[PDB]
């Protein structure tokens, strides 16, 4: 009914780690780790490493950007960083071992895959969230048409919410669920970019993909 | 050269099996440093604090309906399952012991005091070693190292007999073990 | 009431060392453990891997949370440090020795904590390394640890070996001898 990042998810389990509030490393914390890779022979891999940490961050927030309406999104998000923390343990004591940094990079990749799997699993187990999410897409598509030739001056960030209030501001879900309403508001900024001719849109997010995919 | 204080956290999930997998008990425990703080006993069905420091955790975890259901079921989804996954090479693994007998002095100022029966490389640890002097079992003079686990899935043990052999006597070390249907024997002509 | 077998999943995390361990045990012997650095399952006996498997990723998840909990508890206990408990070292052979007949020395390090120790094999004063192996830190019902170090060797009439164990609970390094006695 709803597309999952991983079609037939493997059972995931929670460690009740959703209430942690400082799992994400600050720029200094990361820099301090990067400085351990001081030797010249490790300069090339260190680049690949930094790029991966960045990709990692982008992936985690990507998950919270599309599924902040799924109670379990915090579990997944936090687990991601708790694992990163452990990898850094090795990184910290093998800071100039190129093969080890290569492995760490490979692991961060697996951590991300695991995130996608578990994410898909928890979504598969929450029928109601699936229905609401699908609905958000349904309406955004309607809105894609409805706003066909209207002026969309979204410069002061006020028109988007107003449009959503006009068209659907009355729908139980738009009034009660901030994440849902936000999905639609996010939607018009996407619609606008679509009208202007942006073609990268589907790669923007699972939501964007679902909306502009046929 | 590192005087820094250390902090240790251990977690253990124990699956106790009785008569195959007929009766099963799961014991989950949290140990801070060298002291258990909280535990889940499948015989209880919910977390119980062992020390005061563990109360917050029992209270929090026990309020998690979905979690307790998982644990209560684990007896099947975890314990019974993993027992099966490995039965072949664990419950079933059998390795025949190698038996040898050689003399030794109880003191470097004594004659040729005791006979040592060396039983090594076997598995499981369950085993029996007896000493016979001309068909007559000997017991009052036996001393052993006790069972020894080598840490690589094999055991060993030395069973010694305190007896000064005299010409004509024939001692025998008999070893009974699950890997062999008929007792192993090694003789030693005095 | 007759207990036949025990399968234990044991894991731990230690500070400030930042070292963790995840492993499965059967009746006292290690079935397998997950090398944290490489993040991969390693079987105590290679045959085991040809009949079973384990998603190392799982270990990573568990240790990750373990690490978080250590932070929590240390703080909650008001930073109470673990009390060093020195090991009992014993060294014996795999089987009876015969000149030039391959054998193996086993150094048993037992009843200690924390799980940090430095071991060194010595043949006539020189540290030996080729061929030596060791187990990870094995659990004990009293929550202390067990560890085994192995040294394959060719018996001779002119060699004395000793296992040197260093631990925070010890005053000076402990040194166990072996010269066929």
């Amino acid at each position: 009914s709803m597309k999952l990042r991983v079609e037939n998810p493997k059972k995931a389990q929670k460690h009740f780690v959703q209430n942690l509030n400082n799992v994400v490393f600050t720029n200094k914390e990361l820099e301090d780790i990067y400085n351990l890779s001081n030797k010249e022979e490790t300069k090339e891999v260190l680049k690949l490493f930094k790029l991966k940490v960045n990709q990692f961050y982008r992936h985690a927030f990507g998950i919270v950007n599309d599924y902040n309406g799924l109670l379990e999104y915090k579990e997944i998000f936090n687990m991601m960083f708790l694992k990163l923390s452990v990898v850094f343990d090795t990184q910290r004591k093998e800071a100039n071992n190129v093969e080890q940094i290569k492995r760490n990079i490979a692991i961060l990749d697996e951590i991300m895959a695991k995130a996608d799997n578990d994410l898909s699993y928890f979504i598969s187990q929450n029928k109601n969230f699936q229905e609401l999410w699908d609905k958000a897409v349904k309406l955004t598509k309607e809105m894609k048409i409805k706003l066909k030739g209207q002026k969309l001056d979204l410069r002061d960030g006020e028109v988007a919410i107003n449009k959503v209030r006009e068209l659907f501001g009355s729908d139980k879900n738009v009034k009660e669920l901030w994440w849902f309403r936000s999905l639609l508001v996010k939607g018009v900024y996407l619609i606008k970019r679509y009208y202007e001719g942006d073609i990268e849109l589907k790669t923007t997010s699972d939501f964007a993909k679902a909306v502009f995919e046929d | 050269g590192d005087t820094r204080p250390r902090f240790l956290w251990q977690l253990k999930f124990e699956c106790h099996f009785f008569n195959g997998t007929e009766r099963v008990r799961l014991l989950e425990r949290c140990i801070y440093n060298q002291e258990e703080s909280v535990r889940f006993d499948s015989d209880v069905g919910e977390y119980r604090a062992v020390t005061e420091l563990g109360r917050p955790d029992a209270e929090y975890w026990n309020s998690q309906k979905d979690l307790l259901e998982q644990r209560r079921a684990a007896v099947d989804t975890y314990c019974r399952h993993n027992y099966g996954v490995g039965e072949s090479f664990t419950v079933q693994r059998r390795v025949e012991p190698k038996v040898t007998v050689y003399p030794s002095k109880t003191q470097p100022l004594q004659h040729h005091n005791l006979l040592v029966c060396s039983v090594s490389g076997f598995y499981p640890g369950s085993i029996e070693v007896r000493w016979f002097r001309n068909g007559q079992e000997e017991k009052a003079g036996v001393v052993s190292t006790g069972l020894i686990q080598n840490g690589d899935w094999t055991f060993q043990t030395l069973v010694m007999l305190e007896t000064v052999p005299r010409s004509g006597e024939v001692y025998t070390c008999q070893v009974e073990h699950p890997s062999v249907t008929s007792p192993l024997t090694v003789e030693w002509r005095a | 009431i007759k207990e036949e077998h025990v399968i234990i999943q044991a894991e731990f995390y230690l500070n400030p060392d930042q070292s963790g361990e995840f492993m499965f045990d059967f009746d006292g012997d290690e079935i397998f453990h997950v090398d944290m650095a490489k993040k991969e399952t390693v079987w105590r006996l290679e045959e085991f891997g040809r009949f079973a498997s384990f998603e190392a990723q799982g270990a990573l998840a568990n240790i990750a949370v373990d690490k978080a909990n250590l932070e929590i508890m240390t703080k909650r206990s008001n930073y109470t440090p673990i009390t060093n408990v020195p090991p009992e070292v014993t060294v014996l052979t795999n089987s009876p020795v015969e000149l030039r007949e391959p054998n193996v020395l086993i150094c048993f390090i037992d009843k200690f904590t924390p799980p940090v120790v430095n071991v060194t094999w010595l043949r006539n004063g020189k540290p030996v390394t080729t061929g030596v192996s060791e187990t990870v830190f094995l659990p004990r019902e009293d929550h202390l640890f067990r560890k085994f170090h192995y040294l394959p060797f060719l018996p001779s009439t002119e060699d004395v070996y000793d296992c040197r164990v260093e631990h925070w609970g010890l005053d000076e390094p402990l040194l166990k001898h072996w010269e066929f006695d």
């Binding site: 942690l20 | 955790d57 929090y60 993993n82 | 079935i31 009949f51 929590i72």
Partner: peptide, 13 residues
């Protein structure tokens, strides 16, 4: 055959 494990839980608060 696959060895399944028990998930670790995050301590109170």
């Amino acid at each position: 055959p696959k060895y399944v494990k028990q998930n670790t839980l995050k301590l109170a608060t």
